[PDB]
From Swiss-Prot, chain C:
The chain holds residues 1 to 49 of 1049 of the full protein. The chain crosses the membrane at residues 10-28. Homotrimer, with large domains that extend into the periplasm, interacts with AcrA and TolC. AcrA may be required to stably link this protein and TolC. Interacts with AcrZ. Part of the AcrA-AcrB-AcrZ-TolC efflux pump. This is Multidrug efflux pump subunit AcrB. It comes from Escherichia coli (strain K12). Induction: Positively regulated by MarA, Rob and SoxS transcriptional regulators (at protein level). It comes from the Bacteria.
């Protein structure tokens, strides 16, 4: 207890920095990464709501389930931003037109994944019997996080990209 | 064994949600085959690194499924979209589709590794717990990309049914006929909605700050624990 | 590879920054000594009559 305790902000600060750097290399831009990194909270709110309204705690299973939720939501945002930038760079489309083409093309695969995984973790949410405490804890945070991440991201990612692209020329 | 059962159940539920969108048996198997191939592969990587089959590594497999199907779905869906927009045969659309996303798939895995790797550097007691998830999930993602570059393309070129240019399955009769027309209309409603959001913009930046402050409040209110107390079908009573 | 990073100087910086990060973090946790283990090990049996 007394020798060492709570090194959480340190490792997730590095994580946040390295994710930014990796995105900066991917997009060849110091600014465009922010359009993807601003989706993190969209999946966190839903996980926190789910865990709060089921009387669960911020534990290991909530944390790893939240990193998974952030992973997919960020991955969805990356492919939306990538498709938009492609249309602007290669096809030479406008900011708005390209962003609308991106989200239009990326809707089906986003929902396909979201529904598959949300429904896939249903057995864990409603789980009873041996180890249900861990199953309930995993599924609850993920299901809650995935639904907010899915519904919010599809409307917010296009705002993030358009807003970020405009502030930085 | 209860977590192993929810893996099987999750793969079956993945299959059904895939059949709702792809609407043909062969196409539905491409994402459904990719998951167990990667997951089984992940067990061999845990074996190489001296890790064990445990609650945390097993839940690593369950959480991984989301990242695995997405890799497979991104590849399969994009081929279907190319086939529908241009009318290329499966083999040509596959070559084309892989050409424009294979770079991103590899890039995404390195961005996502930067999310999961860090918590493998927690120290002492808590360290080993978080390290089980990190290595399980990161190993699965690595295999997922390698499976997305070898098998998924090969299956897409051989198992996917040729789609004619402009055909979004709206001409089908039955449930798929109605669903395809519902989704195509819903996609127009979506883009029309986003198109309107992009004109406002400012009122969503302020709404986003509300979601972030809402998040912050819930985070500090929510009590923090470590690992739940499980009913293990046994307990003890002390007489002093 | 040189031609690739000539057109992508941000990628070039990212690789360099990540390497400096791993190093900066490493320094904090590295042991300090005059030498490593340079001495061959010894075992002593002690008895009394
Ligand atoms: C499709 C995705 C993959 C799903 C996940 C894969 C399943 C994971 C199972 C985890 C638990 C496995 O636990 C492992 O079970 C196998 C049998 O199956 C046992 O192996 C057994 O082999 C034979 C099987 O008849 C027995 O006669 C023998 O007694 C025993 O050695 C191992 O001793 C045990 O350690
Ligand atoms: C300690 C080790 C230090 C090394 C750390 C390295 C981490 C950085 C990884 C970031 C991931 C980058 O991911 C990589 O992005 C570049 C962006 O030019 C993509 O590259 C692609 O981008 C566009 C495509 O329109 C073209 O300019 C380029 O020709 C093409 O290859 C790759 O397809 C992708 O794999
Ligand atoms: C507490 C968090 C709440 C999360 C909410 C997340 C978003 C919810 C789903 C998106 C629904 C928004 O609905 C969408 O709003 C925009 C802007 O108001 C509307 O846009 C409409 O009004 C604006 C201005 O009044 C016009 O410039 C535009 O031409 C017109 O279409 C869209 O017609 C509507 O479809
Ligand atoms: C793939 C990433 C490998 C992670 C390396 C684990 C480091 C564990 C040492 C932490 C100190 C006990
Ligand atoms: C012609 C294309 C060459 C692309 C070279 C990228 C390799 C980067 C490796 C970085 C290792 C640290
Ligand atoms: C650690 C990230 C450093 C960001 C570089 C800033 C770019 C400015 C270019 C004008
Ligand atoms: C271990 C400190 C709390 C974790 C918050 C995500
Ligand atoms: C209770 C169903 C059997 C568990 C092993 C998969």
């Amino acid at each position: 207890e007394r020798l060492s305790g709570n090194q959480a902000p340190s490792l997730y600060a590095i994580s946040l920095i390295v994710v930014f750097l990796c995105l900066a290399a991917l997009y060849e831009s110091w600014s465009i990464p922010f359009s993807v990194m601003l989706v993190v909270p969209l999946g966190v709110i839903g996980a926190l709501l789910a865990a709060t309204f089921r009387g669960l705690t911020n534990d290991v299973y909530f944390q790893v389930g939240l990193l998974t939720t952030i992973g997919l939501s960020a991955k969805n945002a990356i492919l939306i931003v990538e498709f938009a930038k492609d249309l602007m760079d290669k096809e030479g489309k406008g900011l708005i037109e390209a962003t609308l083409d991106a989200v239009r093309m990326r809707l089906r695969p986003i929902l396909m994944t979201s529904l598959a995984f949300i429904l896939g973790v249903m057995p864990l949410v409603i789980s009873t019997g041996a180890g249900s405490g861990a199953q309930n804890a995993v599924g609850t945070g993920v299901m809650g996080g995935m639904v907010t991440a899915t519904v919010l991201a599809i409307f917010f990612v296009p705002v993030f990209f358009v807003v970020v692209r405009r502030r930085f020329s | 064994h209860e977590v192993v059962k929810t893996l099987v159940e999750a793969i079956i539920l993945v299959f059904l949600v895939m059949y709702l969108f792809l609407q043909n048996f062969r196409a539905t198997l491409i994402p459904t085959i990719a998951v167990p191939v990667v997951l089984l592969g992940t067990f061999a990587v845990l074996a190489a690194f001296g890790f064990s089959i445990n609650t945390l590594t097993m839940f690593g497999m369950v959480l991984a499924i989301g990242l695995l199907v997405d890799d497979a779905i991104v590849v399969v869906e994009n081929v279907e979209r190319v086939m529908a927009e241009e009318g290329l045969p499966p083999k040509e659309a596959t070559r084309k589709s892989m050409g424009q996303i294979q770079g991103a798939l590899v890039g995404i895995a390195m961005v996502l590794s930067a999310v999961f790797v860090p918590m493998a550097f927690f120290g002492g007691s808590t360290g080993a717990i978080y390290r089980q998830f990190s290595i399980t999930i990161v190993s699965a993602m690595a295999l997922s990309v390698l499976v997305a570059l070898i098998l998924t393309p090969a299956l897409c070129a051989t198992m996917l049914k040729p789609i004619a240019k402009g055909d979004h399955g709206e001409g089908k009769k039955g449930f798929f006929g109605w669903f395809n027309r519902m989704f195509e209309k819903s996609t127009h409603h979506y883009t029309d909605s986003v198109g309107g959001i992009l004109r406002s913009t400012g009122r969503y930046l302020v709404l986003y700050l509300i979601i972030v402050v809402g998040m912050a409040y819930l985070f500090v209110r929510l009590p923090s624990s470590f690992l739940p107390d499980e009913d293990q079908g046994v307990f003890m009573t002390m007489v002093q | 590879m040189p031609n690739f990073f000539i057109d992508r100087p941000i990628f070039a910086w990212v690789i360099a920054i990540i390497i400096m990060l791993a190093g900066g973090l490493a320094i904090l946790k590295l042991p300090v000594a005059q030498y490593p283990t340079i001495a061959p090990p010894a075992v002593t049996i002690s008895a009394s009559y």
